[PDB]
Amino acid sequence: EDLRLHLLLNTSVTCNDGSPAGYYLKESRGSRRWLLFLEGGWYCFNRENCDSRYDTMRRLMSSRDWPRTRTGTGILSSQPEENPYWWNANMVFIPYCSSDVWSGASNEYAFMGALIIQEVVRELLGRGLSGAKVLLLAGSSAGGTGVLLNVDRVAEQLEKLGYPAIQVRGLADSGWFLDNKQYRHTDCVDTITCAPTEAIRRGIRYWNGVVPERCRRQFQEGEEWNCFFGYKVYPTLRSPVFVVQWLFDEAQLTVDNVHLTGQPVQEGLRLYIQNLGRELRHTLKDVPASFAPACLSHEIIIRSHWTDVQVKGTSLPRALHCWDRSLHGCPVHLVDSCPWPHCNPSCPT
Ligand SMILES: *[C@@H]1O[C@H](CO)[C@@H](O)[C@H](O)[C@H]1NC(C)=O
Numbered sequence: 001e002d003l004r005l006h007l008l009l010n011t012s013v014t015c016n017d018g019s020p021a022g023y024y025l026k027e028s029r030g031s032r033r034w035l036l037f038l039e040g041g042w043y044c045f046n047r048e049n050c051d052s053r054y055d056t057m058r059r060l061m062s063s064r065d066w067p068r069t070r071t072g073t074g075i076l077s078s079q080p081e082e083n084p085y086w087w088n089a090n091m092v093f094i095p096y097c098s099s100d101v102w103s104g105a106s107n108e109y110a111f112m113g114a115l116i117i118q119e120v121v122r123e124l125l126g127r128g129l130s131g132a133k134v135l136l137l138a139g140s141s142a143g144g145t146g147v148l149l150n151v152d153r154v155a156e157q158l159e160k161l162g163y164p165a166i167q168v169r170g171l172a173d174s175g176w177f178l179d180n181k182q183y184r185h186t187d188c189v190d191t192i193t194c195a196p197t198e199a200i201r202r203g204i205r206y207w208n209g210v211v212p213e214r215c216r217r218q219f220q221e222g223e224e225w226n227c228f229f230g231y232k233v234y235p236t237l238r239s240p241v242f243v244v245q246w247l248f249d250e251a252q253l254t255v256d257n258v259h260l261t262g263q264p265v266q267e268g269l270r271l272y273i274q275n276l277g278r279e280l281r282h283t284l285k286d287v288p289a290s291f292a293p294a295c296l297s298h299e300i301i302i303r304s305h306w307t308d309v310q311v312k313g314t315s316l317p318r319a320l321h322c323w324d325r326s327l328h329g330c331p332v333h334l335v336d337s338c339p340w341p342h343c344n345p346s347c348p349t
């Protein structure tokens, strides 16, 4: 019972290199719950940048390497030991082969992230999704941000198509970033050197990216990049969204030009890092369903050890279960208050 690969029938919706996009599916006929997972793994924001990603990470720009089956992990696992509350769900894994944070709507690379999602949903309706009660759009890293950019379009899509009983919800893991100033400025030459703001501004135009309608209308024409930042887009969303976010996300630190060795940390950097945690906590204050441990890490929800981390005595699977119950003792808002990564003893290594 692996998830099984299906390539999109509309052959014009493609990965970056023109190969067909697709999705992996494990059906569970007794369940009315669907979990659609968006894979993450950075992005590229211009031709030179994508060329470089093509040479070091070709698998994220193509379908040509995808095996026909894959075993679900963490929240996609069918083993109750690994997924105690959601193991019986219908499981969908959408691989990330568009390098556009799932926003693309476009010789050259194609960027069709948002179209891919639109198309997957359409096809899943013929494979059981039409009888769903709950559709959880989940994602890690770029896929996390992707949830925030697409969850309401999916809700609108299903309503337009005549399926108003499906409850669409979001689960965004490691996709909630701050468009902050770097620790030390560096010119936008790479993907790792590049300030969060500049990466996206460049990317959006290069991808023909789209953002949620209501977030689009909150910023000026051409300033759609704002909606890539969770704390700005979140209040515009209608679907309920659970935000999982490490307080000291490695990708956040990377774009902030912070490169931790094993060494003692300098004064300037202790203030920076600590202030990052503080600002992140502040943005989460407004999010009623969240799980934000004080750890230095990146992604969690499809890692097999996702059951191990705890905030205030509650595990992440249990927090999500408590969130299911709240939408149908059991806390849903779980933010570490301690000021430095690994002050929580259940952090992974
Ligand atoms: C197939 O996908 C392309 C690319 O997005 C789209 O423009 C076209 O309308 C689609 N065709 C059908 C029949 O849906």
Ligand SMILES: [Cl-]
Residues within 6 Å of the ligand: 004
């Ligand atoms: Cl098959």
